[PDB]
Amino acid sequence: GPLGSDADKNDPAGKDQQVNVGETPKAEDSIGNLPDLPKGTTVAFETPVDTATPGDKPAKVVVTYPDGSKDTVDVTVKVVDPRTDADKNDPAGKDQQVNVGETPKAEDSIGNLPDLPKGTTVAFETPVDTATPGDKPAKVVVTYPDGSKDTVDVTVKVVDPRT
């Protein structure tokens, strides 16, 4: 019947690429075997890739051959945030007051817990000594959901209730 099309002859290969938040990915970087394909073959994303948020993005690369025939390739574009949760957040430390013998909670030594990501945890680097009154220096370790950590310097004021 007719002589075959360029798409009838070739099969383009999908390739996963990695980019940063705000970076625009190139279709060429999503195709492995571009030299196996004919000279003059162009590659483009069917849908311009969204890189405003991190995460694995689904994409379609349209392969237009010199004769006009086209092939569609399904790929994944890995979008990553170069800035960690520790870069994206600033914990507001609070100096807390307790009585002699009371155990202080690290939660009560950080005032902006909801401003921090969901799943973030707070603990004292070293347990606070409350056996005697006075201003006890402490460090609250803020462990973010991405694994990153911030460290806040606070004061635990220990008071004698019979004074």
Author numbering: 225 to 387
Task: Reproduce, without paraphrasing, sentences from the article in which this PDB structure was first reported.
Proteins attached to the surface of group A and group B streptococcal human pathogens that contain tandemly arrayed Rib domains have been associated with invasive infections and proposed as potential vaccine candidates.
The similarity of the Tm of RibR and Rib2R is consistent with the lack of a large stabilizing interdomain interface. To further assess the interdomain orientation, we performed molecular dynamics (MD) simulations of fully solvated Rib2R at room temperature (303 K). The rmsd from the crystal structure fluctuates by up to 10 Å while that of the individual domains varies by ∼2 Å, showing that the mutual arrangement of the domains fluctuates in time around the crystal structure. Modeling of the 3 interdomain rotation angles suggests that, while a wide range of long axis (x) rotations (α) are accommodated, rotations around the y and z axes (β, γ) occupy a more narrow distribution. Given the lack of interdomain stabilization in Rib2R, rigidity in the interdomain linker is likely to be influential in maintaining the interdomain interface.
